[PDB]
Amino acid sequence: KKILAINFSTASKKGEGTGYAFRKDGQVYVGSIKAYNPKKTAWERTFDIVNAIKDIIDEFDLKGYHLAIETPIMGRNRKHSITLANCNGYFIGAIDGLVNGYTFIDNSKWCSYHLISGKREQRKEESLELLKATGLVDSNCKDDNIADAYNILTYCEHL
Amino acid sequence: MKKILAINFSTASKKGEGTGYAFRKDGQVYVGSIKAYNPKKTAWERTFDIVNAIKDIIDEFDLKGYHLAIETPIMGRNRKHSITLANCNGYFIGAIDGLVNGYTFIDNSKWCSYHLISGKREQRKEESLELLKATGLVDSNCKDDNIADAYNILTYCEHL
C-alpha cells in the first residue's frame, strides 16, 4: 500500500525519462527524471536515474515502500528491448533493499483498469488525460512518463 | 594485476547449473558456482539468492573494489525467456554495483575467441572445461561449465 510506482525508461530518445509517483502523508508526489544524452550509454543514463531516485527516497525519507515497476517487454526493436530489460533490472537491483521488494506491473493490466486502449502512442495521450484531471501537473503537461507512473500507482492502490 | 570478479551469470533454471565466479586474491585464483536450482522459485527469486551468495563471497574474501566482469546478455529464440534472462542479469549487476568498482560487459564471442574456443554451445562448454581442468582447480571429471566460463572470462579480462 506504501508504493513507489516507476515507469522506467533509459531516455534513448529526446524528452523521455523515468517517471515516479508515490503518496506520503496522503499527498501524491509525481515527477520524471529526464536523462537523454547520446554521449552516455543506456547503462550510464540508468546509473544517473538510480541516483536521482535514491535522492528522492532520502528527501522524502521513504521507509518500507514497495516498488511497483512496469514489466519489461519485447518490442519491435530487439536490441533496444534487451538493453531496456537489462537496464530495468539494474534499476531494480540498485534500489531493492531501499525499497521492500518489488512487483512487476504489466502495461496491459494497469492500462485495462484505467480503460487506456489503442496503440502505444495513443495510450500515452490517454494516460496523460488522467494525470491532467488531478491537477498535480499543469494543463500544458505532455509528460507521459509522469502520467504512466501515476496510473500505475492508482492501479496498485486499488489491487 | 587488475582486481576482477568474473561472473558467468545464470538463474540456475536447469538442475546442476548455477552462477560461476572466479577472482584472484594474493596471486591465487578462487573459483566456484552458486547452485541455486529451485523450480519452486521464479527466476528473479533465484537471482536474489545468487546476489546474496555473491555478497557473502565479497564479504568473506574482502573483495570490495574489485571490478565486475560479466557476460553480455544476448538476443535469443524465445522473446520472453531472453527478456527475463536480460532483466535478471541486470538485477544482479545493480544489486552489487557499489560493492564492486563498476562493471564491464564481456561478450561470449570475445572471451571464446581469445581462448581459441569455437563450435556450438555444448562443444564450447567442453573446450572451456578443458582449460579449467588444466589448472588443477577442479578434478579431471568436472562438468561444471559455469565455473569454467567464469575462469576463462577472468583470464581473458586479465590480459586486457
Residue numbers in the entry:
A (entry chain B): 2 to 160
B (entry chain A): 1 to 160
The authors write:
The RuvC from Lactococcus lactis phage bIL67 (67RuvC) was confirmed as a functional Holliday junction resolvase in both in vitro and in vivo experiments. However, unlike EcRuvC, it showed a relaxed structure-specificity, binding and cutting fork and X junctions almost equally well. The 67RuvC enzyme has the classical RNase H fold common to many nucleases and integrases including its cellular EcRuvC counterpart which comprises a central 5-stranded mixed β-sheet (β1–β5) flanked on one side by 2 α-helices (αA and αB) and by 3 on the other (αC, αD and αE). A non-crystallographic dimer is clearly observed in the asymmetric unit of the crystal consistent with symmetrical resolution of Holliday junctions in vitro and the previous cellular RuvC structures.
To investigate the modifications responsible for this difference in structure selectivity, the crystal structure of a 67RuvC D8N mutant was determined at 1.8 Å resolution. This nuclease deficient mutant corresponds to an EcRuvC D7N mutant, which lacks one of four essential catalytic carboxylates, and was chosen to facilitate co-crystallization efforts in the presence of branched and unbranched DNA substrates. Purified 67RuvC D8N was screened for crystallization and well-diffracting crystals obtained in a P-orthorhombic space group subsequently confirmed as P212121. Following unsuccessful efforts to determine the structure of 67RuvC by molecular replacement utilizing models derived from EcRuvC, the structure was solved using phases determined from a selenomethionine-incorporated form of the protein with data collected in a multiwavelength anomalous dispersion (MAD) experiment at three wavelengths. The structural model was refined against a 1.7 Å data set collected at the high energy remote wavelength. The structures presented here, where D8 has been mutated to an asparagine, confirm that these residues are indeed clustered together in a pocket recessed slightly from the surface of the protein, which is partially obscured by a loop formed by residues 12–16. Overall there is no major difference between the structures with and without Mg2+. Residues that come close to the DNA in the junction include R77 and R79, which protrude into the junction centre. The electron density for the side-chains of these residues is weak in the free enzyme structure but it is quite possible that these residues would become ordered when the protein is in complex with the DNA substrate.
